[PDB]
Amino acid sequence: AAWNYGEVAGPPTWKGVCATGKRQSPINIPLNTSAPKVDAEMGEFDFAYGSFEKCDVLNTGHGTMQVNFPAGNLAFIGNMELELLQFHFHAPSEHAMDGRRYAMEAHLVHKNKSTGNLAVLGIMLEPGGLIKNPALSTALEVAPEVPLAKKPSPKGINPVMLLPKKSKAGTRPFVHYPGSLTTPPCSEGVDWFVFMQPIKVPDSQILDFMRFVGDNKTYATNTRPLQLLNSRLVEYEL
Amino acid sequence: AAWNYGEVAGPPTWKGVCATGKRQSPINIPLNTSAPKVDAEMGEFDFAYGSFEKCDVLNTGHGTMQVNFPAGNLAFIGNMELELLQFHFHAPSEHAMDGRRYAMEAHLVHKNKSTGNLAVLGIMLEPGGLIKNPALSTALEVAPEVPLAKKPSPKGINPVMLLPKKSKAGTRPFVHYPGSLTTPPCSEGVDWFVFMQPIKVPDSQILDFMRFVGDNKTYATNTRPLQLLNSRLVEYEL
Ligand SMILES: O=P([O-])(O)O
Ligand SMILES: O=P([O-])(O)O
Ligand SMILES: O=P([O-])(O)O
Ligand SMILES: O=P([O-])(O)O
Ligand SMILES: O=P([O-])(O)O
Ligand SMILES: O=P([O-])(O)O
Numbered sequence A, B: 001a002a003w004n005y006g007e008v009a010g011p012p013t014w015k016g017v018c019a020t021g022k023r024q025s026p027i028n029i030p031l032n033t034s035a036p037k038v039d040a041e042m043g044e045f046d047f048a049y050g051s052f053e054k055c056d057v058l059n060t061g062h063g064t065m066q067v068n069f070p071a072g073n074l075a076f077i078g079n080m081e082l083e084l085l086q087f088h089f090h091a092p093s094e095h096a097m098d099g100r101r102y103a104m105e106a107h108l109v110h111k112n113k114s115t116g117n118l119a120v121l122g123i124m125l126e127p128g129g130l131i132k133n134p135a136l137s138t139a140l141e142v143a144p145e146v147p148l149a150k151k152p153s154p155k156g157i158n159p160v161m162l163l164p165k166k167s168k169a170g171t172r173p174f175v176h177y178p179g180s181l182t183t184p185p186c187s188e189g190v191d192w193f194v195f196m197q198p199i200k201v202p203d204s205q206i207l208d209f210m211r212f213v214g215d216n217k218t219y220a221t222n223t224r225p226l227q228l229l230n231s232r233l234v235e236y237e238l
């Protein structure tokens, strides 16, 4: 009949810009579309991330844990310098590609040192991996139980492990578009770069994360529904 | 302000008995409780599932697939004859054990020949299994992806495979309680038997099922919240 489970009741009740905004994330990312793809002409990312950062792991109390970093983790793109602030995860992925979401999505949030605005790199996490992603692994182990608490992690964290390998041609193809934080206050003016290439994590880790989101008592999600592109352009650095 | 993702939005708005009835499923099943427990004194289940070749797999448009059986598969418990009509699944589990849901719950739905009620057997699926479960596997393989569509299974689907292994005393401990269907119209007078011993399953299959629940484009759940026990008691045949 006309009964369903439906989507989580949360997001559609969010107020503020979350409802009125016209530049909201996440959005769909067409990549097998018939429409012309506007090249972002921005170059390739160059990453200067540390290999054993010492991090605070916060429990955001909204599902994901948040691994915070000290300065000196820099990513370079389009003549700007982005500094890494923190990473966290969402399951399922928040962006889709051609309408389809992935098992998880890592978000690596940066400050644009050039501008002061927020930049966010999104990486899709796919099931099927056989090597435990140590960044995600450490972030699940150190994650404090009490919401809004934060323990320092004993192990180091290499955030490079949440980025795609360079392809056979040396690229890390991506798409770029202006958007917003995916959680309240859903603030706009955020620059989004989303990597086309997923990383393969093991299925155990994805379930571990959904378990974390469900507070070790069930399996839950923490993703916002797709938003309307509106008059925005997605730019492709393939 | 405060905000969350929440749970799915559909269930709390299901109407009719879903809302008014006082014998609804699922429920939390205490086990590590001081409280004394009423023994079911019903003996152990015996299974005579035979006519499992040539059965249909149906996509219900409500998340799970449903493996329909022909007449002739019987289960016996107490003085009672349970005729298997179909099985399907939920992720995460619908019933909880001390407030803990498992990754999946299998529901084998029978007609109780002896009372003219339905009877539902309920098995928890945990991750961490080394062998694909064959019933769940074929269910996933054969299940048509188009909603409302059904397809005959080429291979035979042995429903016994969804039952936990006998304990080191020859038994499969379970709890019994009168409840309802977990989906609308939530009709009451369903006999629930929930087994206490989960079956371990490869994480691949759990994500594959959550994938199926998500129209093969996301990962989603299909579970109703827990329901008040009210006047009932839970019978334990441990
Ligand atoms: O440091 P990368 O950007 O060459 O990996
Ligand atoms: O920035 P490079 O040294 O990884 O090419
Ligand atoms: O990609 P899978 O086979 O781990 O589900
Ligand atoms: O950084 P997010 O949580 O707003 O996506
Ligand atoms: O393989 P497990 O650790 O997810 O059970
Ligand atoms: O068999 P159920 O899922 O309607 O309880």
Ligand SMILES: [Zn+2]
Pocket: A088, A089, A090, A107, A182
């Ligand atoms: Zn995020």
Ligand SMILES: [Zn+2]
Pocket: B088, B089, B090, B107, B182
């Ligand atoms: Zn069910």
